[PDB]
């Protein structure tokens, strides 16, 4: 349909900040290539 | 001939070498423009991301002592340079590998150490020869050095904006003339969760993580700042004291009179003309009393509690305001002034203090760090600190080297020809030394996904007349003149790396056996 006519709207900052944070998360996690575990004290 | 009776020393040497080499190869991945970071989960339950080697090794709880010496090495390099910690540890690994080769190559370790000393002397001479003197005043070369160090950690994401950040900060904190070793602790780092790393900001001023205590005052203009140490509460002596009540007017005389005392305090404070109050911790005794807060808010004075004693020197350096510890000394002479000071609102409701613009320009400076993940913020601050460190290193020695392993292959070539010239088993030693230096370009090619051996060999062949300007390029995926790709690191970095590694390898060779203790 046309959400503009339907009134289905979202605030811009939602999608903007969402995509930005998602990109940062992807950058952080993707750069991983090894975990090293330590059983506790 | 002479007979070697024992074999325990040789075996323990071998064990140490294998451990060191394994640690080196473990670090080997995280390196260079193509570097890949690691993550360590603490047994406590903490999690960290890191690409810098020193933090990696400090998070390591290494068992075998040799690698603990390696960790210590990395710590020293970081407290000297900031990157190349990866480089210096990888050199250590390669050196010890060639040391193995020389051990089954039957040569006694002491001769190895002496030959290594000759080798490092030749190397330091060559490295000093190859550099390019560079004045501190040229911003763009500084910027190139920055972006060289930066595009190896995660923050290469916003490298383009982070590099001017760091360089401007350092220029504002240095004396551009004395060429001293301007301290990094004069730079304030703020880990503030939320936001975007892009939104990292410089504040030519002062930032306090604490929050306001006045309900009603948020922004103040033309504010005059004053920092006060003596508490604002009922007077409580150093030695034990107590009011005695035995009589009639004692009650109201008390109440009225602590009110009057606090009133005198606040009234003098205003009479100085101040409008923004700073109060340090006084955990030993009473802090700022509530009643005094009431007066101050009534008189419309910006107020802050809980200033850490370690921050006081930084604050007075920055805003240019000597503290006051008694009423009388508090005078309009000492009240500092700043163009603006107020409480910003980020994090939705995570509120922060900024004081921008000061007529008395303190040499110090602060950094605000933004970003989504806590871990990525910590890594970003690590990388920025490394950037400041490398700039300081450049300040220490106004010499510049193109990075990209080209210095190292230069070293390998010159040292190999030097070994060919110099006779004796030390010749074999030095040849091993050059083959050891050969590793860094190999790792660069490997993390670059290029054929390592072919690339290294061709790069040596080029470099036979293709001096240090040429080297391994990431962006083109081949070999070119790196200097024109503007990827340069200060001489001190690799110099310190080589020196530290050489001393540590000599020391390791001195070792023969490990004795368990009580």
Swiss-Prot record, chain A:
Role, per record: Component of the chaperonin-containing T-complex (TRiC), a molecular chaperone complex that assists the folding of actin, tubulin and other proteins upon ATP hydrolysis. The TRiC complex mediates the folding of WRAP53/TCAB1, thereby regulating telomere maintenance. As part of the TRiC complex may play a role in the assembly of BBSome, a complex involved in ciliogenesis regulating transports vesicles to the cilia.
Subunit description: Component of the chaperonin-containing T-complex (TRiC), a hexadecamer composed of two identical back-to-back stacked rings enclosing a protein folding chamber. Each ring is made up of eight different subunits: TCP1/CCT1, CCT2, CCT3, CCT4, CCT5, CCT6A/CCT6, CCT7, CCT8. Interacts with PACRG. Interacts with GBA1. Interacts with DLEC1.
Chain positions recorded as ADP binding sites: 10
Organism lineage: Eukaryota, Metazoa, Chordata, Craniata, Vertebrata
Any coiled-coil regions, as ranges: none
Signal sequence, start to end: none
The name this protein goes by in its record: T-complex protein 1 subunit alpha
Similarity annotation: Belongs to the TCP-1 chaperonin family.
Disease listed for this protein: Intellectual developmental disorder with polymicrogyria and seizures: An autosomal dominant neurologic disorder characterized by a broad phenotypic spectrum. Main clinical features are developmental delay of varying severity, intellectual disability, seizures, and polymicrogyria. Additional variable features are non-specific pyramidal or cerebellar signs, and visual impairment.
Organism this protein belongs to: Homo sapiens (Human)
Localization annotation: Cytoplasm, Cytosol; Cytoplasm, Cytoskeleton, Microtubule organizing center, Centrosome
Curated annotation (Swiss-Prot), chain B:
Assigned EC number: 3.6.1.-
Binding residue positions for ADP: 32, 84-87, 151-153, 404, 489
Subcellular location per the Swiss-Prot or TrEMBL entry: Cytoplasm; Melanosome; Cytoplasm, Cytoskeleton, Microtubule organizing center, Centrosome; Cytoplasm, Cytoskeleton, Cilium basal body
InterPro entries listed in its UniProt record: Chap_CCT_delta, Chaperone_TCP-1, Chaperonin_TCP-1_CS, Cpn60/GroEL/TCP-1, GroEL-like_apical_dom_sf, GROEL-like_equatorial_sf, TCP-1-like_intermed_sf, TCP-1_chaperonin
Signal sequence segment: none
One example GO MF annotation: ATP hydrolysis activity
Purpose of the protein: Component of the chaperonin-containing T-complex (TRiC), a molecular chaperone complex that assists the folding of actin, tubulin and other proteins upon ATP hydrolysis. The TRiC complex mediates the folding of WRAP53/TCAB1, thereby regulating telomere maintenance. As part of the TRiC complex may play a role in the assembly of BBSome, a complex involved in ciliogenesis regulating transports vesicles to the cilia.
Record-given protein name: T-complex protein 1 subunit delta
Species of the source: Homo sapiens
Gene: CCT4
